[PDB]
Amino acid sequence: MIIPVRCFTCGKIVGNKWEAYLGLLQAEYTEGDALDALGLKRYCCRRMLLAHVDLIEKLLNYAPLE
Amino acid sequence: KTALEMVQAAGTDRHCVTFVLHEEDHTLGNSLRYMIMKNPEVEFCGYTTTHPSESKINLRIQTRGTLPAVEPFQRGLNELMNVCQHVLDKFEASIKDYKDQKASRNE
Amino acid sequence: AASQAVEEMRSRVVLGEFGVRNVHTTDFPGNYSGYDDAWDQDRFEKNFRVDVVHMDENSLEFDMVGIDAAIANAFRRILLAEVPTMAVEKVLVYNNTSIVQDEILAHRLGLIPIHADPRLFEYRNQGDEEGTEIDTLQFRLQVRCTRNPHAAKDSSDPNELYVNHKVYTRHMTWIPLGNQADLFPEGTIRPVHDDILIAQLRPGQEIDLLMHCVKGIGKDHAKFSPVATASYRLLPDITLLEPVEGEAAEELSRCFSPGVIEVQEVQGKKVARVANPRLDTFSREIFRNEKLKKVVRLARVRDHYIFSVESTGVLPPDVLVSEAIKVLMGKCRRFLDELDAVQ
Amino acid sequence: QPMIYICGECHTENEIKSRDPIRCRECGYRIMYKKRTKRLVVFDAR
Amino acid sequence: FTQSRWVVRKEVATVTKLCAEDVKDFLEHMAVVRINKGWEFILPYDGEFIK
Ligand SMILES: [Zn+2]
Ligand SMILES: [Zn+2]
16 A cells, blocks of 8 residues: 555665655656665665555545545 | 573483573573583583473583583683673774774865 | 695685585584684684774674674674664554554554664563653654645646645654653654655545654564664685686686776786675676686685674664673673572 | 534535434435544554 | 757656646657657658658
8 A cells, every 4th residue: 555664574764765766767767776876775675666556546536535 | 580490410410400591592592502612521512492482492511520510501601701791892992993083084 | 635624624614516515613622633622711812803894874884803603693683683772662543534544554653763762761561551751752643634725726736735645754743751851852852764654645634643652672573673684794715726817817807796806917918816805795606617617716714704784773883783792791691690699 | 412424425514313314414425424433542553 | 849859858747737647648649768868759850841
């Protein structure tokens, strides 16, 4: 649904990387260059952002609102 | 309430005794085993965790002559304490020196 | 001869093509005939040394020379799962109206690192859920999402339609308890990161809750650990048995990481030299090259450990390592006092 | 005093407190949801 | 696109205030991506005066 705070395997904080990752992708980067720019080295951490699906954006469109 | 138990062998005169340490695991077990094995009066020394669902280790000592196994145990603990103290001193000194050099280099 | 074979067997870990060799430790009295291995305190203190090679905020790398794996691994395990920190433990929630469930939201709040110093608080006793100023901290989170009155007609950008539609970790306000307001100056108690996204709202929805923070260790729950990852590795030492000249020198330099091997001109022809072996990852690619399999030897020094501690932000890493060293002293002191009491 | 059910479509508070058949007061919708509780609940962040 | 051969602006959303996805859809019909160089017109110039 929403980005997890910490990488499962090693415990690094990745919860604050989502907006920056999307911004760097928006700048015509590639995923490799973006992930290296954010500083995620161990491949146990790169999959935490490279394989995420953001369902909360789609779910909130069905949520009640005024 | 007690965290240590000594259970002697079947019929041996206190030179074959198992020490049951409570709320411990490999962190102390392996270091203590290493330190005890260095003592040339020890014939056999090893530990084992009883069960994954329990917090214990069974350290075993068998001394060569007749001296009771408690003395090697106490010696090993003391030597380990001294080792860690010395390591702490050296590490702190080195960190402080490097920080001083950083504060005195590039300015 | 037997002398150098035994020396290599007792001082080097040899990386073969199919398996590591000489993995164990054999420096105990009686294992080798020519030597003596009884514990000698002066001989230990003469040879031990520590080299700090790099350090900045939330990072540290240093070397230990002369220590053995049975002790370095104890320090590593202590670092992972016995240095105490502060983590949210109870969440009092009233009026949760977001999409995130209460249990998931509480779990998420559990994992946020806090910037308190865990050396000034005590373990909370069993029961007594209320706590007090000496063994707890408190934060309060309260945000409500509403439509932006000054929104343009575009009606397309979520950042403009709504206000406070994203709940970050900077909306948590420290609530001083007892006399803590005086001892801790303003700004010291706070979440470390300030960017972590907690949840996400739409207009009309509201989150309002209080959370209590207590002291623990990583052995209990992985949210208490102060270290992102702490590890160590043995210093590599590559050695080449015969000189390598010509294009073979370039081939050798390519079978390693960029920095370790260097090629230089001595008379007009390329000579290979192992320059900086610290940087090798041991891809073991030289065993693909048939000709060069027989001219290199791969090994690692047994009594030289290269540590790499990276903290999560609660405390600087050097302090963490100091505490890790002190914990083992604590354990052996505990057992010594116990033994004296029983005798 | 009378209890409030939120309409399932327009989300306008409605009070029934009677056997009156379910139907929204503003729109025609026929589904209602209870409001959240007022008591607090304690969770463990584990 | 009429003013310049290719549009480097990733952030057309900043000018025209739609969500980024709409901007990417709009670019998709008539443009193609060039790495670290923005978007380029999909097909090249022609001798329009021949007619
Ligand atoms: Zn990781
Ligand atoms: Zn209605």
